Amino acid sequence: TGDAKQAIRHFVDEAVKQVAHARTPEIRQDAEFGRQVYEATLCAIFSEAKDRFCMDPATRAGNVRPAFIEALGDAARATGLPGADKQGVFTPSGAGTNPLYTEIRLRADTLMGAELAARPEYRELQPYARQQAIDLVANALPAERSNTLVEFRQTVQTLEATYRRAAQDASRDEKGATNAADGA
């Protein structure tokens, strides 16, 4: 409770397992629907990537979002994620789906939702479950798609920390008195 970093984190692990097994026999049953989870795995991580950076109150205005969005598009480009290039931006679709991570999210959500989950520690605790949940999807293809998945995975995580670290600097110069960042 005093270190949601480890506590709330371990609660997630359990949930993940339960589902892990739940949707494990189906993936091995047939080699196809498992590959569908690969595309959704990225997309879920992508719409969330943008949403995470966007929602973060410490990153509302000109917090480097423009570049953050393009980076993801560039990174998702090499991956080979289905999509299309519109004007000058690459985008797959509107929110993947998240039918797996959402299931474990519900279990832990109803369990934690406590003061420990309050602390901003839940931030870093982003690749904890994914690393696992996504590991399963890797089972259907832990060879290639895996290399691609593990890449876009760490790529996004570092993309946020790097973009956040920068914005954080701007936040320091933001506070003042008037016209701090109204951009009227």
PDB file of C-alpha atoms in Angstrom:
ATOM      1  CA  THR A   1       0.000   0.000   0.000  1.00  0.00           C
ATOM      2  CA  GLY A   2       2.928   2.295   0.792  1.00  0.00           C
ATOM      3  CA  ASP A   3       4.610   1.251  -2.469  1.00  0.00           C
ATOM      4  CA  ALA A   4       1.949   0.776  -5.110  1.00  0.00           C
ATOM      5  CA  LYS A   5       4.993   0.397  -7.325  1.00  0.00           C
ATOM      6  CA  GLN A   6       5.232  -3.230  -6.197  1.00  0.00           C
ATOM      7  CA  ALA A   7       1.879  -3.866  -4.538  1.00  0.00           C
ATOM      8  CA  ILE A   8      -0.828  -2.766  -6.974  1.00  0.00           C
ATOM      9  CA  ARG A   9       1.589  -4.110  -9.576  1.00  0.00           C
ATOM     10  CA  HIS A  10       1.525  -7.651  -8.239  1.00  0.00           C
ATOM     11  CA  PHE A  11      -2.284  -7.626  -8.182  1.00  0.00           C
ATOM     12  CA  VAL A  12      -2.219  -7.041 -11.933  1.00  0.00           C
ATOM     13  CA  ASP A  13       0.000 -10.072 -12.459  1.00  0.00           C
ATOM     14  CA  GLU A  14      -2.645 -12.356 -11.015  1.00  0.00           C
ATOM     15  CA  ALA A  15      -5.480 -11.022 -13.171  1.00  0.00           C
ATOM     16  CA  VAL A  16      -3.287 -11.353 -16.244  1.00  0.00           C
ATOM     17  CA  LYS A  17      -2.625 -15.020 -15.533  1.00  0.00           C
ATOM     18  CA  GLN A  18      -6.300 -15.922 -15.128  1.00  0.00           C
ATOM     19  CA  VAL A  19      -7.076 -14.478 -18.550  1.00  0.00           C
ATOM     20  CA  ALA A  20      -3.768 -15.734 -19.952  1.00  0.00           C
ATOM     21  CA  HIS A  21      -4.955 -19.289 -19.410  1.00  0.00           C
ATOM     22  CA  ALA A  22      -8.535 -18.389 -20.308  1.00  0.00           C
ATOM     23  CA  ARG A  23      -7.635 -17.348 -23.868  1.00  0.00           C
ATOM     24  CA  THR A  24      -4.628 -19.665 -24.188  1.00  0.00           C
ATOM     25  CA  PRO A  25      -6.388 -22.913 -25.355  1.00  0.00           C
ATOM     26  CA  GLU A  26      -8.059 -20.999 -28.169  1.00  0.00           C
ATOM     27  CA  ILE A  27      -4.844 -19.595 -29.610  1.00  0.00           C
ATOM     28  CA  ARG A  28      -3.211 -23.008 -29.744  1.00  0.00           C
ATOM     29  CA  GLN A  29      -6.448 -24.474 -31.086  1.00  0.00           C
ATOM     30  CA  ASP A  30      -6.043 -22.611 -34.372  1.00  0.00           C
ATOM     31  CA  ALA A  31      -3.243 -20.453 -35.783  1.00  0.00           C
ATOM     32  CA  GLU A  32      -5.045 -17.323 -36.992  1.00  0.00           C
ATOM     33  CA  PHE A  33      -7.194 -15.550 -34.403  1.00  0.00           C
ATOM     34  CA  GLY A  34      -3.966 -15.331 -32.410  1.00  0.00           C
ATOM     35  CA  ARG A  35      -2.417 -13.202 -35.120  1.00  0.00           C
ATOM     36  CA  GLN A  36      -5.411 -10.897 -34.911  1.00  0.00           C
ATOM     37  CA  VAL A  37      -4.401 -10.181 -31.324  1.00  0.00           C
ATOM     38  CA  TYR A  38      -0.974  -9.078 -32.599  1.00  0.00           C
ATOM     39  CA  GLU A  39      -2.497  -6.200 -34.557  1.00  0.00           C
ATOM     40  CA  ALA A  40      -4.809  -5.304 -31.680  1.00  0.00           C
ATOM     41  CA  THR A  41      -1.925  -5.557 -29.215  1.00  0.00           C
ATOM     42  CA  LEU A  42      -0.077  -2.771 -30.996  1.00  0.00           C
ATOM     43  CA  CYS A  43      -3.174  -0.712 -31.728  1.00  0.00           C
ATOM     44  CA  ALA A  44      -4.289  -1.002 -28.104  1.00  0.00           C
ATOM     45  CA  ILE A  45      -0.834   0.231 -27.141  1.00  0.00           C
ATOM     46  CA  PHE A  46      -1.003   3.002 -29.784  1.00  0.00           C
ATOM     47  CA  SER A  47      -4.346   4.624 -29.100  1.00  0.00           C
ATOM     48  CA  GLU A  48      -3.430   4.318 -25.482  1.00  0.00           C
ATOM     49  CA  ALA A  49      -0.013   5.783 -26.255  1.00  0.00           C
ATOM     50  CA  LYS A  50      -1.659   8.915 -27.667  1.00  0.00           C
ATOM     51  CA  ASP A  51      -4.414   8.893 -25.035  1.00  0.00           C
ATOM     52  CA  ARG A  52      -1.883   8.490 -22.223  1.00  0.00           C
ATOM     53  CA  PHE A  53       0.175  11.445 -23.398  1.00  0.00           C
ATOM     54  CA  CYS A  54      -2.948  13.445 -24.182  1.00  0.00           C
ATOM     55  CA  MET A  55      -4.817  12.706 -20.940  1.00  0.00           C
ATOM     56  CA  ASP A  56      -1.758  13.294 -18.745  1.00  0.00           C
ATOM     57  CA  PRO A  57      -2.750  16.707 -17.188  1.00  0.00           C
ATOM     58  CA  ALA A  58       0.965  17.526 -17.160  1.00  0.00           C
ATOM     59  CA  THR A  59       0.816  17.302 -20.938  1.00  0.00           C
ATOM     60  CA  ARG A  60      -2.333  19.083 -22.172  1.00  0.00           C
ATOM     61  CA  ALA A  61      -1.227  22.115 -24.204  1.00  0.00           C
ATOM     62  CA  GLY A  62       1.850  22.250 -26.436  1.00  0.00           C
ATOM     63  CA  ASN A  63       3.422  19.369 -24.554  1.00  0.00           C
ATOM     64  CA  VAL A  64       5.112  17.914 -27.644  1.00  0.00           C
ATOM     65  CA  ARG A  65       1.991  15.958 -28.664  1.00  0.00           C
ATOM     66  CA  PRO A  66       2.434  16.710 -32.422  1.00  0.00           C
ATOM     67  CA  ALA A  67       5.811  14.980 -32.460  1.00  0.00           C
ATOM     68  CA  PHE A  68       4.603  12.241 -30.086  1.00  0.00           C
ATOM     69  CA  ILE A  69       1.823  11.312 -32.524  1.00  0.00           C
ATOM     70  CA  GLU A  70       4.095  11.319 -35.585  1.00  0.00           C
ATOM     71  CA  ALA A  71       6.700   9.221 -33.792  1.00  0.00           C
ATOM     72  CA  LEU A  72       4.139   6.518 -33.129  1.00  0.00           C
ATOM     73  CA  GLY A  73       3.067   6.677 -36.764  1.00  0.00           C
ATOM     74  CA  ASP A  74       6.694   6.321 -37.851  1.00  0.00           C
ATOM     75  CA  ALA A  75       7.385   3.467 -35.443  1.00  0.00           C
ATOM     76  CA  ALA A  76       4.151   1.693 -36.372  1.00  0.00           C
ATOM     77  CA  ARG A  77       5.206   2.123 -39.976  1.00  0.00           C
ATOM     78  CA  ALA A  78       8.282  -0.084 -39.733  1.00  0.00           C
ATOM     79  CA  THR A  79       6.278  -2.627 -37.766  1.00  0.00           C
ATOM     80  CA  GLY A  80       3.968  -3.028 -40.765  1.00  0.00           C
ATOM     81  CA  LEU A  81       0.798  -2.279 -38.827  1.00  0.00           C
ATOM     82  CA  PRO A  82      -2.228  -2.246 -41.250  1.00  0.00           C
ATOM     83  CA  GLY A  83      -3.384   1.284 -42.026  1.00  0.00           C
ATOM     84  CA  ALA A  84      -3.195   4.150 -44.490  1.00  0.00           C
ATOM     85  CA  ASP A  85      -1.305   7.423 -44.911  1.00  0.00           C
ATOM     86  CA  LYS A  86      -3.658  10.411 -44.907  1.00  0.00           C
ATOM     87  CA  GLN A  87      -2.274  13.777 -46.005  1.00  0.00           C
ATOM     88  CA  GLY A  88       0.882  13.607 -43.872  1.00  0.00           C
ATOM     89  CA  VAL A  89      -0.054  11.318 -40.972  1.00  0.00           C
ATOM     90  CA  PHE A  90      -0.148   7.518 -40.672  1.00  0.00           C
ATOM     91  CA  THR A  91      -3.040   5.972 -38.736  1.00  0.00           C
ATOM     92  CA  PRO A  92      -4.454   2.371 -38.510  1.00  0.00           C
ATOM     93  CA  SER A  93      -7.900   3.006 -37.030  1.00  0.00           C
ATOM     94  CA  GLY A  94      -9.821   4.553 -34.128  1.00  0.00           C
ATOM     95  CA  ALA A  95      -8.781   2.628 -31.012  1.00  0.00           C
ATOM     96  CA  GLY A  96      -7.774  -1.005 -31.491  1.00  0.00           C
ATOM     97  CA  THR A  97     -10.067  -2.945 -29.164  1.00  0.00           C
ATOM     98  CA  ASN A  98      -8.258  -4.178 -26.048  1.00  0.00           C
ATOM     99  CA  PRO A  99     -10.419  -7.309 -25.418  1.00  0.00           C
ATOM    100  CA  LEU A 100      -7.667  -8.999 -23.370  1.00  0.00           C
ATOM    101  CA  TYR A 101      -5.849  -6.368 -21.328  1.00  0.00           C
ATOM    102  CA  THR A 102      -9.282  -4.877 -20.624  1.00  0.00           C
ATOM    103  CA  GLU A 103     -10.395  -8.122 -18.969  1.00  0.00           C
ATOM    104  CA  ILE A 104      -7.459  -8.209 -16.555  1.00  0.00           C
ATOM    105  CA  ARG A 105      -7.894  -4.480 -16.123  1.00  0.00           C
ATOM    106  CA  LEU A 106     -11.395  -5.028 -14.776  1.00  0.00           C
ATOM    107  CA  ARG A 107     -10.304  -7.661 -12.270  1.00  0.00           C
ATOM    108  CA  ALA A 108      -7.444  -5.628 -10.828  1.00  0.00           C
ATOM    109  CA  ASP A 109      -9.447  -2.407 -11.137  1.00  0.00           C
ATOM    110  CA  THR A 110     -12.133  -3.715  -8.820  1.00  0.00           C
ATOM    111  CA  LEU A 111      -9.414  -4.996  -6.466  1.00  0.00           C
ATOM    112  CA  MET A 112      -7.056  -2.029  -6.246  1.00  0.00           C
ATOM    113  CA  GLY A 113      -8.894   1.258  -6.901  1.00  0.00           C
ATOM    114  CA  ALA A 114      -7.494   2.074  -3.450  1.00  0.00           C
ATOM    115  CA  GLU A 115      -5.254   4.855  -2.152  1.00  0.00           C
ATOM    116  CA  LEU A 116      -2.198   2.960  -3.361  1.00  0.00           C
ATOM    117  CA  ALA A 117      -3.602   3.125  -6.905  1.00  0.00           C
ATOM    118  CA  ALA A 118      -4.077   6.833  -6.359  1.00  0.00           C
ATOM    119  CA  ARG A 119      -0.387   7.768  -6.242  1.00  0.00           C
ATOM    120  CA  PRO A 120       1.028   8.662  -9.724  1.00  0.00           C
ATOM    121  CA  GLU A 121       3.094   5.489  -9.374  1.00  0.00           C
ATOM    122  CA  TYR A 122       0.575   3.753 -11.630  1.00  0.00           C
ATOM    123  CA  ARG A 123       2.226   5.676 -14.481  1.00  0.00           C
ATOM    124  CA  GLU A 124       5.457   3.699 -14.856  1.00  0.00           C
ATOM    125  CA  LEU A 125       3.453   0.547 -14.109  1.00  0.00           C
ATOM    126  CA  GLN A 126       2.482   0.706 -17.809  1.00  0.00           C
ATOM    127  CA  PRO A 127       4.611  -2.115 -19.344  1.00  0.00           C
ATOM    128  CA  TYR A 128       4.061  -4.427 -16.372  1.00  0.00           C
ATOM    129  CA  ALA A 129       0.883  -6.209 -17.520  1.00  0.00           C
ATOM    130  CA  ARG A 130       1.411  -5.597 -21.236  1.00  0.00           C
ATOM    131  CA  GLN A 131       4.867  -7.197 -21.088  1.00  0.00           C
ATOM    132  CA  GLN A 132       2.979 -10.242 -19.826  1.00  0.00           C
ATOM    133  CA  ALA A 133      -0.373 -10.176 -21.677  1.00  0.00           C
ATOM    134  CA  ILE A 134       1.517  -9.374 -24.897  1.00  0.00           C
ATOM    135  CA  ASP A 135       3.837 -12.282 -24.087  1.00  0.00           C
ATOM    136  CA  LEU A 136       0.970 -14.675 -24.758  1.00  0.00           C
ATOM    137  CA  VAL A 137       0.281 -13.205 -28.180  1.00  0.00           C
ATOM    138  CA  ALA A 138       3.998 -13.809 -28.734  1.00  0.00           C
ATOM    139  CA  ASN A 139       3.325 -17.516 -28.164  1.00  0.00           C
ATOM    140  CA  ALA A 140       1.438 -17.801 -31.444  1.00  0.00           C
ATOM    141  CA  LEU A 141       4.470 -16.184 -33.089  1.00  0.00           C
ATOM    142  CA  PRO A 142       7.480 -15.623 -30.751  1.00  0.00           C
ATOM    143  CA  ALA A 143       9.759 -15.468 -33.791  1.00  0.00           C
ATOM    144  CA  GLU A 144       9.227 -12.522 -36.164  1.00  0.00           C
ATOM    145  CA  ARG A 145       6.104 -10.630 -35.086  1.00  0.00           C
ATOM    146  CA  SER A 146       7.665 -10.968 -31.636  1.00  0.00           C
ATOM    147  CA  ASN A 147      10.768  -9.050 -32.644  1.00  0.00           C
ATOM    148  CA  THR A 148       8.476  -6.412 -34.104  1.00  0.00           C
ATOM    149  CA  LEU A 149       6.185  -6.378 -31.078  1.00  0.00           C
ATOM    150  CA  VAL A 150       8.955  -6.200 -28.495  1.00  0.00           C
ATOM    151  CA  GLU A 151      10.379  -3.336 -30.510  1.00  0.00           C
ATOM    152  CA  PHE A 152       7.313  -1.109 -30.787  1.00  0.00           C
ATOM    153  CA  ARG A 153       6.814  -1.998 -27.117  1.00  0.00           C
ATOM    154  CA  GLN A 154      10.017  -0.555 -25.677  1.00  0.00           C
ATOM    155  CA  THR A 155       9.920   2.125 -28.360  1.00  0.00           C
ATOM    156  CA  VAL A 156       6.675   3.600 -27.042  1.00  0.00           C
ATOM    157  CA  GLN A 157       7.718   3.349 -23.391  1.00  0.00           C
ATOM    158  CA  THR A 158      10.897   5.315 -24.049  1.00  0.00           C
ATOM    159  CA  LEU A 159       9.020   7.664 -26.347  1.00  0.00           C
ATOM    160  CA  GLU A 160       6.835   8.723 -23.460  1.00  0.00           C
ATOM    161  CA  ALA A 161       9.603   9.137 -20.906  1.00  0.00           C
ATOM    162  CA  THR A 162      11.689  11.133 -23.384  1.00  0.00           C
ATOM    163  CA  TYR A 163       8.790  13.344 -24.496  1.00  0.00           C
ATOM    164  CA  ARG A 164       7.662  13.769 -20.889  1.00  0.00           C
ATOM    165  CA  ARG A 165      11.133  14.639 -19.602  1.00  0.00           C
ATOM    166  CA  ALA A 166      11.265  17.398 -22.198  1.00  0.00           C
ATOM    167  CA  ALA A 167       7.760  18.757 -21.576  1.00  0.00           C
ATOM    168  CA  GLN A 168       8.515  18.674 -17.854  1.00  0.00           C
ATOM    169  CA  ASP A 169      11.240  21.239 -18.489  1.00  0.00           C
ATOM    170  CA  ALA A 170       8.753  23.484 -20.286  1.00  0.00           C
ATOM    171  CA  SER A 171       6.315  23.099 -17.394  1.00  0.00           C
ATOM    172  CA  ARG A 172       8.891  24.714 -15.117  1.00  0.00           C
ATOM    173  CA  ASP A 173       9.045  27.749 -17.400  1.00  0.00           C
ATOM    174  CA  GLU A 174       5.254  27.682 -17.752  1.00  0.00           C
ATOM    175  CA  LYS A 175       4.235  28.994 -14.331  1.00  0.00           C
ATOM    176  CA  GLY A 176       4.488  32.780 -14.115  1.00  0.00           C
ATOM    177  CA  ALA A 177       1.603  35.214 -13.652  1.00  0.00           C
ATOM    178  CA  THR A 178      -0.280  36.049 -16.862  1.00  0.00           C
ATOM    179  CA  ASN A 179      -0.441  34.506 -20.330  1.00  0.00           C
ATOM    180  CA  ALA A 180       1.372  31.458 -18.962  1.00  0.00           C
ATOM    181  CA  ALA A 181      -0.002  29.335 -21.793  1.00  0.00           C
ATOM    182  CA  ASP A 182      -3.525  30.527 -22.553  1.00  0.00           C
ATOM    183  CA  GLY A 183      -2.714  30.651 -26.264  1.00  0.00           C
ATOM    184  CA  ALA A 184      -5.906  32.640 -26.811  1.00  0.00           C
TER     185      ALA A 184
END
